């Protein structure tokens, strides 16, 4: 399946200026949009190639999304003071509101899940339920928001976007961005070798330039899986729009040939098996 997701962060800056508001959109693992409220006359801006064509495909796209983000930044600067009062916090400290919303779509452009979720200082605050008719508030302070949103009928407007508009734009981005988004790039894999002592040696299994981010790297010894024994770094961006990961075992010297690295990724034909 494919997903369109937006990530909002807003935070107060006591003693330095107004609150800051940053928005980024993503189709799957590719960022296509940003907004930063700290620019003079902040505009929504393209972060992926196919977005430099939306101006001729939808002549109003930038103006209405700019407008939308600017109102969002204004709404949350007030939301920061509302929520701070809910928790009876002073104006001295900085605090953070985050929002994550978007849609998961399977084949034939059909909606799987919609979601809209908010965090305050990094903890769950309020979330739209899977049925998109209702809200879950994480604590008593967030029930202030729940009652407001329920009375005002906001879940229905959220559902309207998530079911109609979120889906339609996922499709448009997928199609207009076919070459970037619909690709699956295999990893480029190799094994390096570092000894530490004479009874032990580090074997590091590398995966470079793959898209999407989803990947599994597994080390086996004689077919028995070494997951509990290995060192996996968290998958990292390569900076060109793909990702890197490595897995490493420390193995008895001389026995290198009894360890295999299994690599699974969505655009490999078959899971690969590598040795040194």
């Amino acid at each position: 399946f494919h997903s369109l997701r937006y990530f909002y962060t807003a935070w107060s800056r006591p003693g330095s200026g107004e609150p800051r508001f940053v928005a980024v959109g993503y189709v799957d693992d590719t960022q296509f949009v940003r907004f930063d409220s700290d620019n003079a006359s902040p505009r929504a801006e393209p972060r992926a190639p196919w977005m430099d064509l939306v101006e001729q495909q939808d002549p109003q796209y930038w103006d209405r999304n700019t407008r939308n983000a600017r109102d969002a930044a204004q709404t949350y600067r007030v939301g920061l003071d509302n929520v701070r009062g809910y928790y009876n916090q002073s104006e001295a400290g900085s605090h953070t509101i985050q929002r994550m919303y978007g849609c998961d779509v399977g084949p034939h452009g059909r909606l799987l899940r919609g979601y809209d979720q908010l965090a305050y200082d990094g903890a769950d605050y309020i979330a739209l339920n899977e049925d998109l008719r209702s809200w879950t508030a994480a604590d008593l302070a967030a029930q202030n928001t729940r009652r407001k949103w329920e009375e005002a009928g906001y879940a229905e407007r959220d559902r309207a976007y998530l079911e109609g508009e979120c889906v339609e734009w996922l499709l448009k981005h997928l199609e207009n961005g076919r070459e970037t988004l619909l690709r699956a790039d295999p990893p480029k894999t190799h094994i390096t070798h570092h000894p530490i002592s004479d009874r032990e040696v580090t074997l590091r299994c590398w995966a470079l330039g793959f898209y999407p981010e989803e990947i599994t790297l597994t080390w086996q010894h004689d077919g028995e899986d070494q997951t509990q024994e290995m060192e996996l770094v968290e998958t990292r961006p390569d900076g060109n729009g793909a990702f890197q990961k490595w897995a490493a075992l420390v193995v008895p010297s001389g026995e290198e040939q009894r360890y295999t690295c299994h690599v699974q990724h969505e655009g490999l034909p078959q899971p690969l098996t590598l040795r040194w």
Binding site: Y6, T75, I97, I126, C166
Partner: peptide, 8 residues
């Protein structure tokens, strides 16, 4: 498009 944003 961005969704609408609702006031906490």
């Amino acid at each position: 498009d961005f969704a609408n944003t609702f006031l906490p």
